[PDB]
Amino acid sequence: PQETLNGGITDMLTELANFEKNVSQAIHKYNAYRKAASVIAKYPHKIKSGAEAKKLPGVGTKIAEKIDEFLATGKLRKLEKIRQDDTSSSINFLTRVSGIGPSAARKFVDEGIKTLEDLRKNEDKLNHHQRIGLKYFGDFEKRIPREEMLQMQDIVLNEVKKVDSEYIATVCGSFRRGAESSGDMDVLLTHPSFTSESQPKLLHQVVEQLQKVHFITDTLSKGETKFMGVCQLPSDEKEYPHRRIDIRLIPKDQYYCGVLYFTGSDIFNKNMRAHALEKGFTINEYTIRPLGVTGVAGEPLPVDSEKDIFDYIQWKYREPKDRSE
DNA sequence: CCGACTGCGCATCAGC
DNA sequence: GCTGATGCGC
DNA sequence: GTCGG
Numbered sequence: 440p441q442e443t444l445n446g447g448i449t450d451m452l453t454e455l456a457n458f459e460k461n462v463s464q465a466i467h468k469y470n471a472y473r474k475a476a477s478v479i480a481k482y483p484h485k486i487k488s489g490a491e492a493k494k495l496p497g498v499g500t501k502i503a504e505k506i507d508e509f510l511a512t513g514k515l516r517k518l519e520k521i522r523q524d525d526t527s528s529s530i531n532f533l534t535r536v537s538g539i540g541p542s543a544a545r546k547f548v549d550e551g552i553k554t555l556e557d558l559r560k561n562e563d564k565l566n567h568h569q570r571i572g573l574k575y576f577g578d579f580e581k582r583i584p585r586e587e588m589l590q591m592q593d594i595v596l597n598e599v600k601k602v603d604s605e606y607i608a609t610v611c612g613s614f615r616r617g618a619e620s621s622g623d624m625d626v627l628l629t630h631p632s633f634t635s636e637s638q639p640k641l642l643h644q645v646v647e648q649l650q651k652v653h654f655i656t657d658t659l660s661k662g663e664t665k666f667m668g669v670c671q672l673p674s675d676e677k678e679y680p681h682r683r684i685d686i687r688l689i690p691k692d693q694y695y696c697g698v699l700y701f702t703g704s705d706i707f708n709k710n711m712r713a714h715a716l717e718k719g720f721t722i723n724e725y726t727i728r729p730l731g732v733t734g735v736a737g738e739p740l741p742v743d744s745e746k747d748i749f750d751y752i753q754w755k756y757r758e759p760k761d762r763s764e
Numbered sequence: 765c766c767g768a769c770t771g772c773g774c775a776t777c778a779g780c
Numbered sequence: 781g782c783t784g785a786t787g788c789g790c
Numbered sequence: 791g792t793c794g795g
């Protein structure tokens with residue numbers, strides 16, 4: 440639906456959400472406001488009253504009350520005030536730097552460090568992640584057009600196969616759902632030699648090759664199963680924005696549960712789990728399991744493709760395209 | 765009334 | 781030194 | 791902040 444429907448309300452709720460997460464450090468209030476924001480964003484009518492909004496799941500007494508104030512006045516007194524607050528708005532802003540959370544942001548603002556400029560001045564007080572986040576502050580907040588994501592996929596699948604043709608790599612996330620743009624790139628990686636009961640250079644070798652051809656440019660974090668970092672498409676034209684890329688190495692017997700999980704959406708993943716229990720199965724990130732007569736979970740069932748998971752719960756395979764809910 | 769709201773990998777801190 | 785807790789991102 | 795046991 441059009442933003443001009445309830446965009447004022449959803450903007451208000453999103454703004455309240457961020458201050459809860461970043462300033463009050465109340466993560467559950469943060470998700471509460473966002474849940475309320477989401478369901479109102481989907482609501483196909485211009486809301487006339489807080490009581491009207493309250494019918495929706497996720498909208499309670501306090502938000503219905505806040506909406507009443509917004510509709511009547513065009514603003515929120517509390518929001519106006521906190522917007523104004525130099526301390527709170529600075530803390531809120533610094534968290535936009537990847538690696539700087541609520542705790543670091545507060546500590547920085549505590550000692551007078553409030554801006555990117557201030558961060559740029561105080562490099563030795565930033566850890567490795569926070570420096571990278573600072574270095575690519577602008578780039579990290581850009582979205583990635585699908586065409587560039589396709590070019591990025593080309594390089595990943597090529598270099599991965601070059602390392603070992605028996606690797607299996609799948610670019611999941613919104614891109615796999617066929618979105619016209621993405622926030623980052625999520626690559627899931629496996630190899631027949633790696634199972635749950637199973638070299639742990641399997642991830643390193645792929646990262647290394649992607650670094651060698653200068654696709655991967657920076658490393659945020661890297662262990663034996665998970666890589667988080669920065670990549671960039673090759674350039675006399677203007678150079679591309681640096682992009683966030685994650686690579687996960689998953690055991691083969693857990694790969695397609697992994698692919699399903701990290702393809703999303705979260706809203707879709709929720710239903711699929713809920714319907715999975717109603718059929719007597721439990722689905723998490725790693726496995727699908729039967730729930731015995733009292734709720735005792737048996738051994739993880741063998742999964743060799745996505746559809747296998749759909750078959751167990753008697754679902755017909757839904758294409759990633761049709762997985763926004 | 766009052767507990768749940770995903771929980772894990774990695775980097776780094778806190779403490780022994 | 782090591783172990784467990786915390787911060788962070790997702 | 792919201793929901794529900």
Ligand SMILES: Nc1nc2c(ncn2[C@H]2C[C@H](O)[C@@H](COP(=O)(O)NP(=O)(O)OP(=O)(O)O)O2)c(=O)[nH]1
Nearest residue numbers: 612613620621622623625700701702703704705770
């Ligand atoms: N249990 C649980 N799992 C979650 C939750 N939130 C997310 N997940 C899981 C399920 C999600 O699929 C995954 C996050 O993948 P991203 O790449 O960060 N999001 P995407 O790629 O779709 O969009 P973008 O284009 O912006 O990158 O984490 C949660 O609250 N609870």
Ligand SMILES: [Mg+2]
Nearest residue numbers: 612613623625
């Ligand atoms: Mg993504």
Ligand SMILES: [Mg+2]
Nearest residue numbers: 612623625685
């Ligand atoms: Mg991601």
Ligand code: NA
Nearest residue numbers: 493495497498
């Ligand atoms: Na409600």
Ligand code: NA
Nearest residue numbers: 534536537539
């Ligand atoms: Na941040």
